Design an enzyme around this catalytic site. Sequence first.
Site, PDB file in Angstrom:
ATOM      1  N   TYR A   1       0.888  -1.151   0.015  1.00 34.04           N
ATOM      2  CA  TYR A   1      -0.094   0.065   0.110  1.00 34.04           C
ATOM      3  C   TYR A   1       0.876   1.172  -0.146  1.00 34.04           C
ATOM      4  O   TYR A   1       0.454   2.210  -0.562  1.00 34.04           O
ATOM      5  CB  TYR A   1      -0.887   0.093   1.170  1.00 34.04           C
ATOM      6  CG  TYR A   1      -2.064  -0.846   1.233  1.00 34.04           C
ATOM      7  CD1 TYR A   1      -2.698  -1.274   2.431  1.00 34.04           C
ATOM      8  CD2 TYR A   1      -2.313  -1.555   0.205  1.00 34.04           C
ATOM      9  CE1 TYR A   1      -3.530  -2.161   2.318  1.00 34.04           C
ATOM     10  CE2 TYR A   1      -3.373  -2.376   0.007  1.00 34.04           C
ATOM     11  CZ  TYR A   1      -4.236  -3.024   1.225  1.00 34.04           C
ATOM     12  OH  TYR A   1      -5.158  -3.903   1.229  1.00 34.04           O
TER      13      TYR A   1
ATOM     14  N   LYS B   1       2.669 -15.848   1.823  1.00 32.99           N
ATOM     15  CA  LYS B   1       2.547 -16.546   0.787  1.00 32.99           C
ATOM     16  C   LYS B   1       3.897 -17.023   0.228  1.00 32.99           C
ATOM     17  O   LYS B   1       4.395 -16.736  -0.673  1.00 32.99           O
ATOM     18  CB  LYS B   1       1.845 -15.807  -0.497  1.00 32.99           C
ATOM     19  CG  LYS B   1       1.515 -16.576  -1.703  1.00 32.99           C
ATOM     20  CD  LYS B   1       0.393 -17.555  -1.722  1.00 32.99           C
ATOM     21  CE  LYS B   1       0.215 -18.338  -2.913  1.00 32.99           C
ATOM     22  NZ  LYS B   1      -0.877 -19.480  -2.966  1.00 32.99           N
TER      23      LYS B   1
ATOM     24  N   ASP C   1      -4.251 -17.991   0.930  1.00 33.41           N
ATOM     25  CA  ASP C   1      -5.384 -18.681   0.282  1.00 33.41           C
ATOM     26  C   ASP C   1      -6.246 -19.776   1.047  1.00 33.41           C
ATOM     27  O   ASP C   1      -7.162 -19.986   1.337  1.00 33.41           O
ATOM     28  CB  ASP C   1      -4.995 -18.996  -0.979  1.00 33.41           C
ATOM     29  CG  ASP C   1      -3.809 -19.852  -1.346  1.00 33.41           C
ATOM     30  OD1 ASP C   1      -2.936 -20.020  -0.180  1.00 33.41           O
ATOM     31  OD2 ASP C   1      -3.691 -20.795  -2.065  1.00 33.41           O
TER      32      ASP C   1
ATOM     33  N   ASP D   1      -5.369  -6.892   6.165  1.00 34.23           N
ATOM     34  CA  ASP D   1      -6.492  -6.036   5.774  1.00 34.23           C
ATOM     35  C   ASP D   1      -7.740  -6.922   5.348  1.00 34.23           C
ATOM     36  O   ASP D   1      -8.982  -6.930   5.825  1.00 34.23           O
ATOM     37  CB  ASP D   1      -6.327  -5.411   4.254  1.00 34.23           C
ATOM     38  CG  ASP D   1      -7.250  -4.157   4.049  1.00 34.23           C
ATOM     39  OD1 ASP D   1      -6.878  -3.516   3.187  1.00 34.23           O
ATOM     40  OD2 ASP D   1      -8.131  -4.162   4.756  1.00 34.23           O
TER      41      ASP D   1
ATOM     42  N   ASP E   1     -11.271  -8.318   7.703  1.00 35.45           N
ATOM     43  CA  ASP E   1     -12.664  -8.088   7.337  1.00 35.45           C
ATOM     44  C   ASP E   1     -13.454  -9.465   7.219  1.00 35.45           C
ATOM     45  O   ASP E   1     -14.715  -9.291   7.529  1.00 35.45           O
ATOM     46  CB  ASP E   1     -12.731  -7.465   5.974  1.00 35.45           C
ATOM     47  CG  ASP E   1     -12.294  -6.022   6.285  1.00 35.45           C
ATOM     48  OD1 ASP E   1     -12.387  -5.358   7.244  1.00 35.45           O
ATOM     49  OD2 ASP E   1     -12.079  -5.169   5.175  1.00 35.45           O
TER      50      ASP E   1
HETATM   51 MN   LIG Z   1     -10.530  -3.313   4.675  1.00 37.63          MN
HETATM   52 MN   LIG Z   2      -4.158 -21.278  -4.467  1.00 38.47          MN
END
Ligand SMILES: [Mn+2]
Ligand SMILES: [Mn+2]
Lengths: 363, 363
Positions: free
Chosen positions: B145, B195, B227, B251, B255
């Site tokens: 970000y 990841k 994931d 983030d 949520d």
């Molecule tokens: Mn958010």
């Molecule tokens: Mn995957």
Amino acid sequence: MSKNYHIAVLPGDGIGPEVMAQALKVMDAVRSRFDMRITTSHYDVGGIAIDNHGHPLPKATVEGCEQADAILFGSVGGPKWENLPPESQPERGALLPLRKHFKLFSNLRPAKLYQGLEAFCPLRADIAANGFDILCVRELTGGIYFGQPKGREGSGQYEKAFDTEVYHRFEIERIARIAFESARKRRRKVTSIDKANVLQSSILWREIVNDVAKTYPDVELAHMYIDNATMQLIKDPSQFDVLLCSNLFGDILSDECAMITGSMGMLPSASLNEQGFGLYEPAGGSAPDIAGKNIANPIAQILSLALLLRYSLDANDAATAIEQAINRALEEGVRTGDLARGAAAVSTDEMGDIIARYVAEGV
Amino acid sequence: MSKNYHIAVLPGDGIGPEVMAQALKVMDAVRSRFDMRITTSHYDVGGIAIDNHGHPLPKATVEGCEQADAILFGSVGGPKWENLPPESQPERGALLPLRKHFKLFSNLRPAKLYQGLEAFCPLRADIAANGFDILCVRELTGGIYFGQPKGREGSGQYEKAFDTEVYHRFEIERIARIAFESARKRRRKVTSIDKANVLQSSILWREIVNDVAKTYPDVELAHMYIDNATMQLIKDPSQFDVLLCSNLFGDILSDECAMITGSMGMLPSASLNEQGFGLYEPAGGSAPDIAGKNIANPIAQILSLALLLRYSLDANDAATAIEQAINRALEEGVRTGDLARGAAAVSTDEMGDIIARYVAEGV
Ligand SMILES: [Mn+2]
Ligand SMILES: [Mn+2]
């Protein structure tokens, strides 16, 4: 009257060989029904390849895929190699290089909740009864997975590592087209996933998807942030038709779509280049838990053979027969253990025997 | 102790002044029962600052925050200011510069399914019945970000835009320690989310978190790919204690955690710097649609006061007393209109009355 197509068959690890054996059953029913000439060769990939060759993607395997019209792929990986350097791990050292090498920019993963399998959906029963049917279109060969620069530098408190989420216009143009074309064949709705409030690459993504959209005035286009999408697939999955995603965002949301079906053992995957060559596989992993127990649902693998016939072998006829064979079995109430949740289930083998049989049986 | 704590109170727009009143009412009950000296100064932020000062983050507000031990923040935004340029709108113009100004590198978002509120969980009933209780720790001031390089260049089909997911050792260590220290006070389990099978920045992240773990041998450490974590939070959220995340991954997952509770009006948020100064606010937004109607759930804001007391004012006893009062209110069947309907719910100011009295009566 066939061309004698060739398929490189890469069963891999875990339940891979078990469910691949079922798909080859079905493939033999397709040959000797649609009178297609289909020739295959088996190659090691992943952990089995690491065992026999010291590498997860042998040159001979890549060469075998090169000589084929499409790759029918099982799954790779397991705890027996979840100890190796990433560059040496079966899942990444095989898949990422296969995608790059064959330029498979386009990943298609259809996730729907099958009517009557609502019990297995992990979402609340009222949400489940509403139903959902989604195609997640993931960009597979660009962005942060492959972007440069990518590495590590320095030492001490300012030692750093870095990856680059970079997209070129052409990369977004071509994946955006796949999404919109797919939408026309479905419910004409695309929801493009980005993080355009902050990411420069998302701002370009959104811009190019808006530009492509002008070719498709019949398709409803929405844009949604990744963090909102993650919530909405739980809150109300019925709102999505086609999801259009970056490499990384697609990796996340496509697996989320798989989870919310509650039936990942029915979910196929196709990864396609511009020339129509593809890699077709189940959406799930090697499942080492049940590997070798004749439990695994072969339907994801068999449905990915259907995608293979449709997209790579110009044989929608055979693809649709297979899907038909699978709905009949499910209509009859045939279930492997995952969708019986154990009781009254058939084995991998019988499910595969049944589907192969219904295909050749015409109906 | 020393006493004489000072708090900068930034109620904001919409439901913010409403729910903030009830946090301040409970805070007086804390003053009395715990003999604490807590003085406040209120400041405009967001929409109301635009109205009164022409922009969402006045200098008198930032200075008032500098002169305080912590920031008790409501919410900001609403339709009245949506006709401004995005970058000039209340939340973008206020929340981000404050985090940056005050180096609020850590974001703590506790998410639990409260006994009695399972019906609102969007997951299948038997999953909701199992319960969960998660603290998501999100690196808040770094990563893609804010990483450089970031931009857009070139022309034609090879025009490109790019963002950089970059992390330094000092960033990773400080946020990892927060997670380990938090897990020590909960159920002694940190799952670090990355990841690392694909990203270079994730490989360093995983490496440094493993080093930091050696300092907290009394806390379990597991790693999980982003994931998988997106799937697992739907499948079995009971498996997690503390999540340790990058800015992007945190983030998304905070949520998703918020979504799986099904009741955002209960959820608080802490954003802390290395000196223990913090900004405490509800997880949810300014809810313009119910603003001013005295129905907004004040429990998010009240629990963010509890977090302010625990992390900034060394007042864990006071924080725990607020939490117990909320448990008590819920056990007595007390609900706001997001948790029940008609006469089974109470208004914002009545919920606050009930919570403040249960704290006052606790001692
Ligand atoms: Mn958010
Ligand atoms: Mn995957």
